[PDB]
Amino acid sequence: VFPLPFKIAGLGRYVPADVVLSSDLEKKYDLPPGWCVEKQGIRERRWVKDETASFMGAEAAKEAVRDAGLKLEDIDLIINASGSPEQAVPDGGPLVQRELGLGRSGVPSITVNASCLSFFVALDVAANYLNMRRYKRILIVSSDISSVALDFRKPENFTLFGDAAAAAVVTLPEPGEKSCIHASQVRTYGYGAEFSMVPGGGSRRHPNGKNTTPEDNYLHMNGAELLKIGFEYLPRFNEALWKQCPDITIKDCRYVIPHQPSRVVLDYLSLTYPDDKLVRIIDRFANCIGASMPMALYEAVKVGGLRRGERGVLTGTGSGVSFVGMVFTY
Amino acid sequence: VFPLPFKIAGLGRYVPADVVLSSDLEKKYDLPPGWCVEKQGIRERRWVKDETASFMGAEAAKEAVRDAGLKLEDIDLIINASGSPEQAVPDGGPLVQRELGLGRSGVPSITVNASCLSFFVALDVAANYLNMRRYKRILIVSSDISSVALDFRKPENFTLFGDAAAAAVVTLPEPGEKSCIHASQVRTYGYGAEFSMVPGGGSRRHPNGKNTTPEDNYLHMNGAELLKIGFEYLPRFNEALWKQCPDITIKDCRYVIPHQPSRVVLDYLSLTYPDDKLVRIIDRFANCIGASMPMALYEAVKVGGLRRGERGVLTGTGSGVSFVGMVFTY
Ligand code: NA
Ligand code: NA
């Protein structure tokens, strides 16, 4: 089954233009100077002005299409892979298709939803479409506006979240090119659903029904219990991932590219690997939910200079709870 | 590329136990006797008591797993493919995994979202995973509770919607078995997004923001404009679908199995094909959104007696606007 031919042909990003410095948030909301950097690992973030999520996604997508040496008309499948919805109906796929000027194109546009790990799962889905020769040039878009959830009474909230979009065009590699996936794995532990969830926003606690509570529209998080899921199941997850590519180990990989919704994953990695192995975006873009991993992938290539033939590792933990990992040659 | 080996190994359904007769709705809400059957094509529907969407999905899934001759522990991927969310976070995949008692299993559980055509797109995604030998035994679950959207001031609304879940287990066929996909196609016309949409429920019109209006949480529908998308693009859609399987035509197919959110698609088909070719569920289960197509697939096999080696056609139009079609040997 592995290795799977797979080429990240183009990458794109959109972030809002206005930088919100942690130092200015601290001055405005009476936090100690340096609090955000120490507690959150966040020095800056970007918040939207009037952008919609589809607008940001389309901007990132256009950059990725240019980067791939393609025109918009060459894309034959669009996958929206964001951490949060723009609206209830339709899904984000058709909305970004419309925003791209492709609304009359017929190009299928769908959503893959694995919460904040949607981008990862979309890559995996796309890899299978490509190798089955179903589609040739697949656009994956992850765009999130988390600044809508900002509560300026709560420092743990309002200093954490940022807005961003990133996108990839994926294709099969050309003859001679080594681009491939060596290993890919997704596991889900739904017993952890209650430790990171928003119980409102759907049928179970519909606003017009009898099951509503005041706390329905807020993220319920139990960090201690989430970590326990990691303690119990991550070692075997990692073991099983690397068994897929026994010829390749972490020493053969230039960059670790994590979903990074908080500094914890980065701190874990920093105790393990040299700093130059780790791709960091939370410092300048904060927690951008579903866009975090693809933002880090963009960073690895467009700032970190990841070269064709070098290898990377995508990794993440997300609400669900799910774990993902992928070892690839760029 | 086609034909693609593909076996619908098991099918399952859950519907609420209490039948709501159109005749009783008409008596209670002062509608003419026979109004629902004439205007909607709906004689009965089922509405939940205390069920959650995950509960119904899990019930349908268990039936499908039994039908496939499997145990729950044999499933290696779960795809939630519903028309509406149970809650905001996490997605429905982990929630149905938990409901099935598989919360500690590690089995990846994700969501594919193409609005009311999610089940179709999940089948397509699953077919590619199966043929790439990534997973062997894939559960697809579509569960929707639309009765939460009921407005008893509006006959066009409250007589239309029903609750239901259906599920499929899909695998590769055994040696000698003819089960396959002859043709599959998805097209999206995002210019039609505004003609069937709910603008609230996400970041664009977040309740705490400045873009809210009173009508945000209601389905905006422009039926005339939706039909125009059909007039312009359906003929070429159908042409392109059947060109994938030039050896197979509609005469070679026993059943047409449509997504059926209203009587219109059924009326179109009834003018074209003998009644015994069409699989109808709206009459007894009403508009069950994302569950409509898989409910009809269940009906085709478990009531219509579709035999292995006979052929069917899945067809649908959904919010987006998207069109789907698949020609398969059962
Ligand atoms: Na850009
Ligand atoms: Na059942």
Does residue B90 have a cis peptide bond before it, meaning omega lies within 30 degrees of 0?
A: yes
Nearest CA among B298, B293, B300 for reference residue B14: B298
Looking at the CA of B66, which ligand is closest?
2
Tell me the C-alpha distance between A271 and B61, whole Å: 43
Nearest CA among B54, B60, B86 for reference residue B72: B60
Q: Is B318 exposed, middle or buried (0-12, 13-18, 19+ CB in 10 A)?
A: buried
Return left, alpha or beta for B115; rule: phi > 0 is left, psi -120 to 50 is alpha, else beta. Answer: left
Between the two ends of chain A, the Cα-to-Cα distance in Å is: 18
Under 8 Å CB-to-CB from B278, ≥6 apart: which residues? B255, B256, B258, B266, B269, B270
A156: its two tokens:
């743990």
- Same-domain status, A191 and A246: yes
Residue B194 vs residues A96, A98, A152: alpha-carbon distances, Å: 13, 10, 34
CA atoms within 13 A on the CB side of A112: 25
> Which candidate in A185, A204, A244, A321 is best for mutational testing of the B interface (most B CBs within 10 A)?
A204
Residues of A in contact with B321 (CB under 8 A): 90, 94
Instruction: Judge whether A61 is closer than 8 Å to chain B, CB to CB.
Output: no
Cα A12 to averaged position of ligand 1 atoms, centre (Å): 5
Tell me the C-alpha distance between A94 and A106, whole Å: 10
Does residue A3 have a cis peptide bond before it, meaning omega lies within 30 degrees of 0?
A: yes
Cα A182 to averaged position of ligand 1 atoms, centre (Å): 29
Tell me the C-alpha distance between A268 and B152, whole Å: 55
Looking at the CA of A164, which ligand is closest?
1
R_g of chain A computed on alpha carbons: 19
Q: Pick from A175, A197, A232: which residue ends a domain? A: A175
Task: Give the pairing type, strands B44-46 and B19-21.
Answer: antiparallel
- Same-domain status, A78 and A181: no
Tell me the C-alpha distance between B11 and B75, whole Å: 14
Contact across the interface for B114 and A111, Cβ inside 8 Å: yes
Under 8 Å CB-to-CB from A279, ≥6 apart: which residues? A255, A256, A257, A258, A296, A297, A299, A300, A304
Within 90-109 of B, beta carbons closer than 8 Å to A belong to 90-91, 93-98, 102-109
A169: its two tokens:
């065009």
Contact across the interface for A320 and B91, Cβ inside 8 Å: yes
Residues of B in contact with A110 (CB under 8 A): 112-114, 121, 186, 188
Nearest CA among B86, B228, B76, B66 for reference residue B143: B86
- Same-domain status, B163 and B240: no
Cα A59 to averaged position of ligand 1 atoms, centre (Å): 6
Tell me the C-alpha distance between A184 and A6, whole Å: 12
CA dihedral B80, B83, B89, B95 (to 10 degrees): -40
- Give the residue carrying structure tokens 């392109």: B240
Under 8 Å CB-to-CB from A217, ≥6 apart: which residues? A198, A200, A201, B88, B207
- Same-domain status, B143 and B230: no
Tell me the C-alpha distance between B198 and B249, whole Å: 38
Q: 3-state DSSP call for residue A244?
A: coil
Amino acid present at A323? F
Residue A14, beta-bridge partner list: A165
Contact B314, B253 (CB under 8 A): no
Contact across the interface for A106 and B188, Cβ inside 8 Å: yes
DSSP codes of every residue in A15-80? --S-EEEHHHHHHHTTPPTTHIIIII--SEEE--SS--HHHHHHHHHHHHHHHTT--GGG--EEEE
Contact across the interface for B131 and A134, Cβ inside 8 Å: no
Contact B117, B322 (CB under 8 A): yes
> How many Cβ atoms from other residues are within 10 Å of residue A267's Cβ?
11
Under 8 Å CB-to-CB from A322, ≥6 apart: which residues? A114, A115, A117, A186, A187, A188, A189, B94, B108, B109
Q: Pick from A113, A143, A175: which residue ends a domain? A: A175
B78: its two tokens:
């779960």
Tell me the C-alpha distance between B16 and B51, whole Å: 8
Residue A185, beta-bridge partner list: A325
Contact across the interface for B188 and A87, Cβ inside 8 Å: no
- Same-domain status, A120 and A184: no
CA dihedral B40, B45, B51, B54 (to 10 degrees): -60
The total domain count for chain A is 2
Looking at the CA of A16, which ligand is closest?
1
Task: Give the pairing type, strands B311-318 and B322-329.
Answer: antiparallel
What is the span of the domain harbouring residue A232?
176-330
Contact B154, B7 (CB under 8 A): no
Instruction: Judge whether A244 is closer than 8 Å to chain B, CB to CB.
Output: no
Tell me the C-alpha distance between A150 and A162, whole Å: 10
Instruction: Judge whether B214 is closer than 8 Å to chain A, CB to CB.
Output: no
Sheet strand arrangement including B255-258: B4-5, B180-188, B322-329, B311-318, B255-258
> How many Cβ atoms from other residues are within 10 Å of residue B194's Cβ?
15
- Same-domain status, A141 and A280: no
Element (H, E) at A81: none
CATH number at residue B221: 3.40.47.10
Residue B260 vs residues B129, B226, B249: alpha-carbon distances, Å: 28, 15, 22
Nearest CA among A102, A96, A53, A124 for reference residue A314: A124
- Give the residue carrying structure tokens 């100690």: A32
Q: Pick from A154, A175, A196: which residue ends a domain? A: A175
- Same-domain status, B292 and B144: no
- Same-domain status, B68 and B51: yes
R_g of chain B computed on alpha carbons: 19
Looking at the CA of A10, which ligand is closest?
1
Contact B73, B139 (CB under 8 A): no
CA atoms within 13 A on the CB side of B46: 22
Residues of B in contact with A318 (CB under 8 A): 90
- Same-domain status, B145 and B210: no
Task: Give the pairing type, strands A109-113 and B77-80.
Answer: unpaired
CA atoms within 13 A on the CB side of B182: 23
- Same-domain status, A111 and A225: no
B76: its two tokens:
């290696």
The distance between the two most distant Cα atoms of chain A, rounded to a whole number of Å, is 61
Residues of B in contact with A114 (CB under 8 A): 91, 93, 110-111
Residue A272 vs residues A215, A263, A278, A299, B242: alpha-carbon distances, Å: 38, 14, 10, 21, 55
Residue B271 vs residues A60, B232, B265, B268, B319: alpha-carbon distances, Å: 46, 20, 10, 6, 24
Tell me the C-alpha distance between A119 and A324, whole Å: 11
> How many Cβ atoms from other residues are within 10 Å of residue B277's Cβ?
16
Task: Give the pairing type, strands B77-80 and B138-144.
Answer: parallel
- Same-domain status, B16 and B118: yes
Among the partner-chain residues B87, B96, B322, the one whose CB lies closest to the CB of A201 is B87
Instruction: Please give, one letter per residue, the 3-state secondary structure of chain B.
Output: CCCEECEEEEEEEECCCCEEEHHHHHHHCCCCCCHHHHHHCCCEEECCCCCCHHHHHHHHHHHHHHHCCCCHHHCCEEEECCCCCCCCECCHHHHHHHHCCCCCCECCEEEEEECECHHHHHHHHHHHHHHCCCCCCEEEEEEECCHHHCCCCCHHHHCCECCEEEEEEEECCCCCCCCEEEEEEEEECHHHHHHEEECCCCCCCCCCCCCCCCCCCCCEECHHHHHHHHHHHHHHHHHHHHCCCCCCCHHHCCEEEECCCCHHHHHHHHHHCCHHHECCCHHHHCECHHHHHHHHHHHHHHCCCCCCCCEEEEEEEECCCEEEEEEEEC
The distance between the two most distant Cα atoms of chain B, rounded to a whole number of Å, is 61
Between the two ends of chain B, the Cα-to-Cα distance in Å is: 18
Tell me the C-alpha distance between A65 and A47, whole Å: 25
Tell me the C-alpha distance between B137 and B77, whole Å: 7
The DSSP code for A173 is P
- Same-domain status, B148 and B206: no
Q: Go through chain B and tell me how many residues it has.
A: 330
